[PDB]
Amino acid sequence: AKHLFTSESVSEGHPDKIADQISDAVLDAILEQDPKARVACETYVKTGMVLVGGEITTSAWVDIEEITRNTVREIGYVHSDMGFDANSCAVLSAIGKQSPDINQGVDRADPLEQGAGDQGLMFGYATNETDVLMPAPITYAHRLVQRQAEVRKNGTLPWLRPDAKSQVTFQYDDGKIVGIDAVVLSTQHSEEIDQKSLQEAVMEEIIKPILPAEWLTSATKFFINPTGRFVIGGPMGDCGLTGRKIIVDTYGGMARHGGGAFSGKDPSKVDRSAAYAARYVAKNIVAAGLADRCEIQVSYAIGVAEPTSIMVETFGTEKVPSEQLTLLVREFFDLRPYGLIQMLDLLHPIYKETAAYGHFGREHFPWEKTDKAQLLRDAAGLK
Amino acid sequence: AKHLFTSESVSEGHPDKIADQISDAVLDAILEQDPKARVACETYVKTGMVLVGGEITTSAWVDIEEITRNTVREIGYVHSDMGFDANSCAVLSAIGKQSPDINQGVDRADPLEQGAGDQGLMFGYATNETDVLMPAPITYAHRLVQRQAEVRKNGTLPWLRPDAKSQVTFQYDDGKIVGIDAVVLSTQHSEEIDQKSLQEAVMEEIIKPILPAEWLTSATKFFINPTGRFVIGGPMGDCGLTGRKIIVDTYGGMARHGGGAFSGKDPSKVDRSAAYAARYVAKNIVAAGLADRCEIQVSYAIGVAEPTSIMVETFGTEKVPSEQLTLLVREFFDLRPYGLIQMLDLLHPIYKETAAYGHFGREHFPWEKTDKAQLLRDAAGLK
Amino acid sequence: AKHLFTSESVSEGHPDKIADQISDAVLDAILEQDPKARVACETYVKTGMVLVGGEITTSAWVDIEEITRNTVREIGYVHSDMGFDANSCAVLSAIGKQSPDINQGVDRADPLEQGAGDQGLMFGYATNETDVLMPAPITYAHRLVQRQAEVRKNGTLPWLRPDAKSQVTFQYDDGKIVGIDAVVLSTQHSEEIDQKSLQEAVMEEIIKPILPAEWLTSATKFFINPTGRFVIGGPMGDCGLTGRKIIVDTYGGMARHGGGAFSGKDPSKVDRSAAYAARYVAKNIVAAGLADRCEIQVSYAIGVAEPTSIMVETFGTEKVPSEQLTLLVREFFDLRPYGLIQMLDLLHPIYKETAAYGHFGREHFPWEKTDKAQLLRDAAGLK
Amino acid sequence: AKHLFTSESVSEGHPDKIADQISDAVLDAILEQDPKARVACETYVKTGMVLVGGEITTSAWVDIEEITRNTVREIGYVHSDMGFDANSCAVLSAIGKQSPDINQGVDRADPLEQGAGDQGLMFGYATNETDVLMPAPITYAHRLVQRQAEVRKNGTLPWLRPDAKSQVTFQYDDGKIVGIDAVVLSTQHSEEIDQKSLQEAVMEEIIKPILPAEWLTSATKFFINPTGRFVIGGPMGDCGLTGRKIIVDTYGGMARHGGGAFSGKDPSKVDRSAAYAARYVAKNIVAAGLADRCEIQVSYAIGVAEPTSIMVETFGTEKVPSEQLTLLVREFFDLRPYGLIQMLDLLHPIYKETAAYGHFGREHFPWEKTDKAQLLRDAAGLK
Numbered sequence A, B, C, D: 001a002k003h004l005f006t007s008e009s010v011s012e013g014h015p016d017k018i019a020d021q022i023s024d025a026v027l028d029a030i031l032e033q034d035p036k037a038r039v040a041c042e043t044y045v046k047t048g049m050v051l052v053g054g055e056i057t058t059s060a061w062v063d064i065e066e067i068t069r070n071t072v073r074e075i076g077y078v079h080s081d082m083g084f085d086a087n088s089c090a091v092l093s094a095i096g097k098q099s100p101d102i103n104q105g106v107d108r109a110d111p112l113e114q115g116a117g118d119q120g121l122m123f124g125y126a127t128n129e130t131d132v133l134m135p136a137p138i139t140y141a142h143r144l145v146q147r148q149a150e151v152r153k154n155g156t157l158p159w160l161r162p163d164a165k166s167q168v169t170f171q172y173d174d175g176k177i178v179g180i181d182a183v184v185l186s187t188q189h190s191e192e193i194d195q196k197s198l199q200e201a202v203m204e205e206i207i208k209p210i211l212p213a214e215w216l217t218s219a220t221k222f223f224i225n226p227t228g229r230f231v232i233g234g235p236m237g238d239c240g241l242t243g244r245k246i247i248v249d250t251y252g253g254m255a256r257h258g259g260g261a262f263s264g265k266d267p268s269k270v271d272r273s274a275a276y277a278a279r280y281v282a283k284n285i286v287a288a289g290l291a292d293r294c295e296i297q298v299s300y301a302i303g304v305a306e307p308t309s310i311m312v313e314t315f316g317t318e319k320v321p322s323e324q325l326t327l328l329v330r331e332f333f334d335l336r337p338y339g340l341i342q343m344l345d346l347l348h349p350i351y352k353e354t355a356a357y358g359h360f361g362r363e364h365f366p367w368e369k370t371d372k373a374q375l376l377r378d379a380a381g382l383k
Ligand SMILES: Nc1ncnc2c1ncn2[C@@H]1O[C@H](COP(=O)(O)OP(=O)(O)NP(=O)(O)O)[C@@H](O)[C@H]1O
Pocket: C040, C099, C101, C102, C118, C120, C243, C259, C260, C261, C271, C302, D014, D015, D016, D163, D164, D165, D186, D187, D225, D226, D227, D229, D230, D231, D232, D233, D234, D237, D238, D244, D245
C-alpha cells in the first residue's frame, strides 16, 4: 500500500518562530527568578517592531527590551539590509496581570488539588520509525532548516539570511519509507548572489548533506526559492505571531493536535505541560515495547485538577490488550496539573531552547527520557 | 473497543475568535471592492486595544477603525462593565503591502500557471458520523457556544457576557457513539448573578437543549465555570490572536492538521483555499459512497502551481481500491491554486461568517456542497 | 493706556495634562527609589490607550501599568460612559535607556563639573501683581479649572466630567487691572443635564465663586460650552501628549518661554531645573524689592556645566541699576546644573503634584520660597 | 544698556521636527484632495517606529505608510547605521474622526459665522532688525541647521547624519547687535570621523560661512558636540513628538507665545491660522512704518467666530498713538476664523514646507507678504 505524506519546518529566523523564541525567552528569564510565576505571554512581530503582551503575574523583575533585542539579535537580524534589526527595531509592551478569577481555580489551598490552567485537549505521540521514537518527516524537515541556520552562522554561506522554510514529502509503501518524492527549501538571501548559484549551493551545503542519499533518486523533485526571488523576508515580508507553528512544533502532521500552543506559558498551563507529559508516556510505552506506535490524548477542565478524559490509541500495533495498557497509564503516571510538573520538573527556565526546531526529539529534554519503560514493562510480561 | 475522544469550541466572544472575526471582517470589506486583492491580515487583541496589521496590497479603500469597531460591537462588548468596548477601545494599524518577491511567484503571466501563495500542507476530512458528514464532537461543541451566544443576544439570559468556551467528551464503543462522559461549559457573567443559579441556568438554557438526552446519563459529569468565578473575560482576562483556533476551526482534533490558519487571508493563500478544497473532495467522496470516512492531504510549494503531494486515507473504510480512488481524485478536481478558486468561486466576501463556529458543517458554504458525488460515483460502479 | 490680555488653563482631566500627570507620576515613583535616576518620559494618550515611552536609565523597579491606571483613575475617568477608563484602557510602553553619548557629557568624574542635560534657553518671571508674585490672568484661570474639578469630586455637580478648559481676559488700564471683559469655561458633562441648566450652574458653582465680583460688570461676556454640546471629551475627543501645555504650565503668556517642557524629566534636565531656578531668582528679586517685575533668562549647552547666557529684564521697574542687579544674580545663585539641584533640592519625588494647575504660584514648592530676598537686599541699600 | 539674548534651532533630522514634518506631510496630502478637510494629526516617533494618530474627518483617501516612509526618507534616515530607516521602520496609526460635538461649533449654516476650532491665545511679531522683519537670533540659528543639512545632502560632509541642533547668543548693546558671545552646534555623525576633525570641519563648512564675520571675535566661544560624542541620534537617542518646537517654529523666544502648535492641523484651527494672521498684521504694521517692532495678540473661544481679545504692543516704538493703531487693526484685517483663511488663502497643501526651519521669515509664504502696509499707511499720515 503506497502513499505520500508531507511535513514542514521553519528556521529560527521565521517570523512566527521569532515570536515564540521571544515569548519563551521572557518566561525563562522570569522563571529563573521565580519558578512559581504565572506567565501567559503573547508576542506580535512586524516590519520594525516587536509587541510583547499578555498577562504575567510574578514577583520577578525583568527587562523586556533587553531580553527581546538580545533574543532577536541572536536569531540573526542585525542590519536594515536584512529587513529587521534587533538594535534599531521598536520594542512595545502591553503586559497585564493574570485574572484573579482564573487564579482561584488554579492555585488552591492544597498544592496537589491545584487545578488546570484552562480547559482543552492535548495529543501525545510516539513511533518506532526512528531512534528518538519520532516520525521521520518532521525529523528531517527540522534538520533542513537547522542546517541552513548553521551554515549561515558558521559563515559557510555568508549570503544566507535568517528567514527560511523547508518542506519534504516521503514515499510510504508497505507502511515504511521507500524514499522522498519532493523537496522544498526556501531561504532568504542577499542581493549579491544569483538564483542558480544559490540553488546549486543550497543542494551541496544544505540538502545533500542532510537527506539520506538512499531516499534520493532521479525521481525526487527539488523546489528551491520557487518565486525565483527571496531577498525580502522576516517581519517585513511576513507577520510573525506566537503559537502559529503548532504542528511543526510537534509531530509534523503525522499525529493529531488539540490546538494549544507552547511558547509563552508556564507549566501550570496544561496546553504545554499535559502535552509534554503525553509525549512522555507515548514514547515510554513504545520504548517499553508495549506498542509500535501510539497516540495519547488527555483533556482538562479549568480549575479542575483531575483530567476530564484520557485515551490511548495503538493502531492495533499494541502487544498487550489496550485494556491493561490503558489501566497501566493512569496507574504509572500522574496527569494532574501538580503531578506532571513534578513528574517532569517543569519549574525551570528550559523553554526558550524549545522554541525553534521541534519540542520533541531532543532526548535531553525531561519528557524525551524513557525511564518508566522498563518498569512499564514489568507491569506486563516482564521477561 | 471502548475509548474516549474530546473536542472543544469557543464563543464568538473569545479573544482569539474576536481577532479572526476582525481579520476576516477586513478581508471581506476589501474583497467586496476588489476580488483579486492580496490580503494577509493579522490581528492582535488585548485589554483596551485591537491591533490590525500584516501585509495588504489592494486597490480598494477601506476604513479599519469602522470595520473593527463595528465588528467588535456586533460581537457584544459595548461597555467597560464587560471589560472591552467597541466604542471606547483603541484601534491600531500596522499594515504594509505584500512583498513583490513573493508576488512574482504567485501572479504570473498566465493566470492558470499562477502559483501557490506559500509552501505547506493541508488536511481535508469527511465522515458519515453525521448528515453534514462532520465528526460529532466538534459539531456539538460548536452548538454549545453558539447557543450560549444566542440565549445572550435574545435576552433570555441577560447576565451572560460574550466570552465563553465549551468542551465535550464522547464515549466511543464499537467505533460508534454510546454517550457523553463529561461536559464543560465556561461563560463570562455579570456581578449580579450567583454561581449556583448560573450553573443551574446554563443547564436548562444551554446544555440540556443542545445535548441529545440519550447520550446524557447519571454518569455524565458537568463542569460549569470551575474556578468558581468568571466575571473578568475578553481581552482583559486573555490575549486574543489571529489563527490560534486552528483546530476548533476545522474538525475538533478528530482529523489531522498542517498548521495553516484561515482568517485574514485571500484565497490565493493555499492555507485557506487548498484546505477548503480538501474538505470538498473528502466530503464528496463519502457522499459518493466511495468510503465511510477519508482524510485528504495536499502540500504545496510557494510560487509553484502544481501540488507537491496528495494522499487519500480511507482507514480501510473504502469501497473501491484506493488506487482508482486516488487516480480519481486528481482526475475530477483541480488542486492548482487557480483551479480551486474557480472550483469554489472564492473571489467573494464570504469569510467573516466563517470566522466563528467552524469552517465546516455549514452546507451553504461552497465547499460543503456535494455535487461531484454522483459523478464521482459514475467513475466507479455507477448502478 | 488701556489694553486687553488673555490667559487660559486646563483641568487635570484634559488629555494633554493627563499625559503630563502620567509622565511625572512615573518619574516620582522612580525617584522615590533612586533620586539620581535619569528619566526622559514622554506619554501619548488617545481613545482607549496610554503610551508611556522615552528613555529611562535607573536602578529602580517600577510598575508602569499600575502607576498609569492609578494616575488616570485618580484624575477621574473610570467608566466607558466618560469615554476613557483607568481599569479597562490599554497601557503601552516603549521605554529604552538613555544614550551613553549624552550621558558622558552630563555625569562627569567631578559632580560639580557635571553638565547640562541639553542645550536650550529658559525664562523665569516674577511680578508684584499678586502676593505670590504671579501674574493675575494665569492665577484665576487655574483657579477656575481647579474649582470645576473640586466641585466635581466633592459631588456638588455630579454630572461634571474630568475634561475642562478655562479662558479669561483682563482689562488693563494704567498698567493695572480694572476688570474682566470675557470669561470662557468649557467642561465635559453627562447626557443627563441640559445646556441652560449647565451654564446657569457653572456660573453659580464655578465662575461666580472664583472671579472677584469687582472685576465682573454688566459688560463681561460669558462663554460656556459654546459649541452647545460637550458630552464627548477626554482622549476620545482630543489626543493628549506630554509637554503641550508649556504656557499654562508657566505664566499664561504674560512672560516669555524658551520651549522646554517640564513633566517626565529628572532635574538634570535644564528645561525643568533651570526653569525653576529662574522663577526662583525672579521671584526673589521682586520680593527683595529690587524691581516690580523682572524676567530672567538662562541658556545652556549640552555637556557643559557653565551657563551660555544670562540676562535680567526689569522693564525699567528696577530700583538698582541693572548693572549691579545682574552682577548680583550670578553672585548669589548657582545656575550650574549641579548647583541648582542642591540649591532647590530637586532629587525628590515632588513633581506629579506639579503636573496640573501650574508649576508656579504654590509657595510650598522649593522654587516659590523667598529666603534670599532679604539677603539679596543687603547686597544693595539694606536699610 | 548691554545684555545677552539666546535663541536656538533644530535640523530637519531632529526627532521632534521629524514628527512635525510627518504630521504636516499627512495634512497636505489630504488637503490636496480635500481643502475643507478637518485634520488634527499628532505624531509620536521613537527607535524603530512612527505613530501617526489623532482625529481626521475627510473625504480624501491617503496612504499614511507611504507618506510617512517617503517623508522620513527625504529627511535622511535610510540605514540602521544612522539609527532609523524609512524603509525598515514601523509605521503605526491611531486615527479616529473629529468629534461632532466640536464640529457643530466650527462649521455652522452660514460659512462666515463659522467658529474657532478651539479656545486659546496667539502671538504675532515683527521687528525692523532685519529685511524680513524677523528677529536676528532665530534667523541665524535656522540658517545654521539648514546649512548643516545642505552640506550633508550635497555630499560636502558625507559623514554628517540628519540629527542636529544649533544655539547662538547675541550681544545686545544700545538695543542693537554688537556681536555674538557663544555659538553652539551639535550634529550627529559617523563612527568614521574624529571629534577634532569634525569640530574643525564644522567651523569651516557650517559656522564660518553662516555667521557674519563682523560679529565673530576672539571673545566668541564655540561649543561643538560637547559630550564629546554624538554618533547615536534621531529617535534612538531622543523621542520625537509633534508640536514640541513651539518656539523655534516662531520667533526664537524674542516675542511671546500662547501655547498652540502648528503642524498637523488644518486652518480652521486658530492655533495655526490666527497665529499666521498675527505675524501678518505685525509685519505689515512695521512695513507700513507705523512702529519699529510690535507684538500682536488675539484670543478665541471654541465655536465662536468673533475674537475674544486683541491687543497690539509697540513697546513705545509706535509712530501713531496706539489708539488709532489698534482701531486700525480691526479696521483693516478680519481675524474671524472664516476671514483669515480667505485673507491668506489657507485651503491649500502648503504646510509640510513649513515644518522645518521656521514658520516665519520666508517671504513667499502668504503671511510673510506685505501688501497692506502702504494701505495701512494711507489710514495714517500717508505722505
Ligand atoms: N550626544 C549628543 N550631543 C549633542 N546633542 C545631542 C546628542 N544626543 C542627542 N542630541 C540632541 O538632543 C536633542 C534634544 O532635543 P530636545 O527636543 O530639546 O530635548 P527634550 O528633552 O525633548 N526637550 P524639549 O522638546 O525642548 O522639551 C535630540 O533630539 C538630539 O538632536
